[PDB]
Scaffold this motif. Structure first.
Motif, mmCIF file in Angstrom:
data_model
loop_
_atom_site.group_PDB
_atom_site.id
_atom_site.type_symbol
_atom_site.label_atom_id
_atom_site.label_comp_id
_atom_site.label_asym_id
_atom_site.label_seq_id
_atom_site.Cartn_x
_atom_site.Cartn_y
_atom_site.Cartn_z
ATOM 1 N N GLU B 102 12.707 2.139 -3.866
ATOM 2 C CA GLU B 102 12.300 2.837 -5.077
ATOM 3 C C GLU B 102 12.136 1.815 -6.192
ATOM 4 O OE1 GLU B 102 15.077 6.283 -5.554
ATOM 5 O OE2 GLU B 102 14.217 6.524 -3.536
ATOM 6 N N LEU B 103 13.030 0.834 -6.195
ATOM 7 C CA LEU B 103 13.017 -0.225 -7.188
ATOM 8 C C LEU B 103 11.750 -1.052 -7.058
ATOM 9 C CD1 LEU B 103 15.305 -0.925 -9.223
ATOM 10 C CD2 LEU B 103 15.677 -2.971 -7.813
ATOM 11 N N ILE B 104 11.472 -1.495 -5.836
ATOM 12 C CA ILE B 104 10.289 -2.295 -5.552
ATOM 13 C C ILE B 104 9.040 -1.596 -6.084
ATOM 14 C CG2 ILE B 104 8.799 -3.169 -3.716
ATOM 15 C CD1 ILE B 104 11.454 -3.384 -2.028
ATOM 16 N N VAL B 105 8.954 -0.288 -5.864
ATOM 17 C CA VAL B 105 7.806 0.470 -6.335
ATOM 18 C C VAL B 105 7.741 0.413 -7.861
ATOM 19 C CG1 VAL B 105 6.813 2.762 -6.587
ATOM 20 C CG2 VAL B 105 7.671 2.025 -4.366
ATOM 21 N N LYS B 106 8.872 0.664 -8.511
ATOM 22 C CA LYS B 106 8.924 0.620 -9.965
ATOM 23 C C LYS B 106 8.400 -0.728 -10.456
ATOM 24 C CE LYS B 106 12.454 3.967 -11.019
ATOM 25 N NZ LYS B 106 13.762 3.918 -11.732
ATOM 26 N N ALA B 107 8.832 -1.804 -9.807
ATOM 27 C CA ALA B 107 8.392 -3.141 -10.186
ATOM 28 C C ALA B 107 6.870 -3.226 -10.153
ATOM 29 C CB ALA B 107 8.991 -4.173 -9.249
ATOM 30 N N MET B 108 6.275 -2.688 -9.094
ATOM 31 C CA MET B 108 4.829 -2.710 -8.951
ATOM 32 C C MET B 108 4.147 -1.904 -10.048
ATOM 33 S SD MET B 108 4.058 -2.508 -4.897
ATOM 34 C CE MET B 108 5.599 -1.792 -4.426
ATOM 35 N N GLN B 109 4.705 -0.739 -10.349
ATOM 36 C CA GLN B 109 4.144 0.119 -11.379
ATOM 37 C C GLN B 109 4.228 -0.545 -12.746
ATOM 38 O OE1 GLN B 109 6.646 3.624 -10.685
ATOM 39 N NE2 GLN B 109 5.012 4.470 -9.395
ATOM 40 N N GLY B 110 5.354 -1.204 -13.014
ATOM 41 C CA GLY B 110 5.537 -1.879 -14.288
ATOM 42 C C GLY B 110 4.575 -3.041 -14.442
ATOM 43 N N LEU B 111 4.401 -3.792 -13.365
ATOM 44 C CA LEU B 111 3.502 -4.929 -13.372
ATOM 45 C C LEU B 111 2.109 -4.528 -13.855
ATOM 46 C CD1 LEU B 111 2.983 -7.952 -12.201
ATOM 47 C CD2 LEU B 111 2.052 -6.690 -10.261
ATOM 48 N N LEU B 112 1.684 -3.314 -13.517
ATOM 49 C CA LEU B 112 0.353 -2.850 -13.896
ATOM 50 C C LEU B 112 0.294 -1.837 -15.028
ATOM 51 C CD1 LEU B 112 -0.778 -2.367 -10.228
ATOM 52 C CD2 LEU B 112 -1.457 -4.268 -11.718
ATOM 53 N N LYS B 113 1.441 -1.507 -15.609
ATOM 54 C CA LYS B 113 1.464 -0.540 -16.702
ATOM 55 C C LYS B 113 0.564 -0.969 -17.862
ATOM 56 C CE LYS B 113 4.477 1.684 -20.080
ATOM 57 N NZ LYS B 113 5.873 2.193 -20.206
ATOM 58 N N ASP B 114 -0.061 0.014 -18.499
ATOM 59 C CA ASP B 114 -0.946 -0.233 -19.629
ATOM 60 C C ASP B 114 -0.231 -1.025 -20.715
ATOM 61 O OD1 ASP B 114 -3.351 0.986 -18.827
ATOM 62 O OD2 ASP B 114 -3.515 2.048 -20.742
#
Lengths: 129, 129, 129, 129, 129, 129
Positions: B102-114
RNA sequence: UCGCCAACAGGCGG
RNA sequence: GCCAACAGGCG
RNA sequence: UCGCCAACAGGCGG
RNA sequence: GCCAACAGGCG
């Protein structure tokens, strides 16, 4: 202006937030690192380059560590039990306008949005079914 | 249950939304494609596999087309002027729990957040500065 | 959407209808079968793939049981004497839009409409004359 | 009687209807074509042969063209941008009665009825899921 | 419908229940796993194939792990002390009706019912006598 | 103890129950069969052995007769068309305590409980979807 | 497709 | 490690 | 006669 | 094209 700033890599509410800060920008490779022991830090690198006459290539990398304490001979050190490695390459033709690029970004964000197939599968140690 | 469903790849408001639908799942590779001419369609593929004794590797790919009409000899066909190619590989050790993922996913989402560095740079035909 | 649902394969006017339902999705190949032993069932399978650079190909297969003098749930040998096999292969150029494909479907429906040559010939154990 | 008659291949509601008519029976292959130039015509062919000692095989082919006007050498000619090919083979055991065969025809009709899975997927440029 | 759903593999009376959920369908092998790290998870897989011209074979596998925490290189990792493997193959003739199959399912259920010989012996680390 | 006793293999609610009883113990292999001709009987065999230094292996085999359209006491050929074979192989590490083994048994019961995927698929002549 | 074995969708002998 | 027309190519 | 591919009554491998 | 301890390794 500058986009080589620190940012929140992991949004764990408003407290357990993982922030990475600029650490080095040598040989065209920007690198961010989270605070405390480098051994247990999160790492993000990014770089762009003209891969060909018509293409520009972005190479982004992220490292997510599993924090742990290693004890050997009674001596404990802060380490990472293991690390998850994310490696992405994005190729964009030089004809792409800013609007075209905005779209590409949206595509990436959607691909990982909460609830969608890929993120769900990953977050659950699963594949597609 | 099934995560091999159709989803919104691009959230262009609530109208110009680009949706991709399951098209094929052969040889362990799941593939989604947007509607209309395959020649101008968006493409997403995903696959997982045990890359090593301790690692599981996800290979995700996205293709964003630049819609255009090619006219040759008075004959016009719907094509893609060019395509942006996204290729990502995610390696996760078998010790990772669901929380770890779940953490890994969050990291990915944050990396691309607006607003963050990487997405901003890409969306503006720029690099890091 | 989500087209993988049961449907009426043989419409005998509400009474004596043959419904076929999802029975398998292994390898992206969709399968439907009637409520019968596999030896006497009505079977339908469908799958799509990019057969070549310019084409996409749909492969549809149907199995129809010989019913005259059939013994429900019994062992009927030889298998070849009790079953009819239909193999359809539809090749569609990647330029075909949704509209184009609707037309193709219509053509297929017209080819088999009641009263037309082909269905008439088949239904009568005859050829063309 | 004689089942070698013209029929409506594509029903567009009386207006824009594609009709094919007998055009050839050479070498035991019945053929129909639309009232067009041989280069832009819809083509339907059919043949029956006693494949095995106990089977009869029907081979049906349909060609749906995408009409266009190409300019070759400064001159305009009626051509087909591309063509969609439907190739189907139906094997029926010699023990099949006429009712047995009507069953087959009905199943094929049901398989492609508007609203059913397969025709839906095809018309939507997608797979089944 | 869709039978690819999560289910309770080990019923411990609501508390301590082991549940497995769909995690993969790549290469036609349905897979379920418990909400654990891939290294300590319970695993269930299943597949069907037409073995002979007149047989269908189901291949089911279950992995029951003995969870433990091992210390490798001074670091603690979630592992399985050992695993118990159940491998079963079921061959059913194509002439088997649904009732015929329900019979099979019932027999398998009865074979392992609490109090019966086989489950008793297994649970007692003994043979039959 | 002394587990080699008769038991109900197929429970049809008191009426129409299939009981299987001891019929052989040659070579330590336990065998049970229903009151039928060997060709139409329900057969169950079980045996245990140390398959390797760390493992013990239980081999359970079950034979279920095809009942639909069966002719009691008659000669039904080919045998393969009238019988289903179940082969189970359970491997248990020598460290497994009685408690551990109870768990394993539970897992097996859960795998086949009414309403769960596997039994449902089998009972319906289907795979997973 | 039969017999084995496994660390278990894999390996050996037929 | 790189390249691409991108589930593919070269070291 | 089975598996593929096509420009589709044709071509390749069995 | 793959692998990894991951801005590195082999075809």
């Amino acid at each position: 202006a500058s986009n080589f700033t620190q940012f929140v890599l992991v949004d764990n509410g408003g407290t357990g937030d993982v922030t990475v800060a600029p650490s080095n920008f040598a040989n065209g490779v920007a690198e961010w690192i989270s605070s405390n022991s480098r051994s247990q830090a999160y790492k993000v690198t990014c770089s762009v380059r003209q891969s060909s006459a018509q293409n520009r290539k972005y190479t982004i990398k992220v490292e997510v560590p599993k924090v742990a304490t290693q004890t050997v001979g009674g001596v404990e050190l802060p380490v990472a039990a293991w690390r998850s490695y994310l490696n992405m390459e994005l190729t964009i033709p030089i004809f792409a306008t800013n609007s075209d690029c905005e779209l590409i970004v949206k595509a990436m964000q959607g691909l990982l949005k909460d609830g969608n197939p890929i993120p769900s599968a990953i977050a659950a140690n699963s594949g597609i079914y």
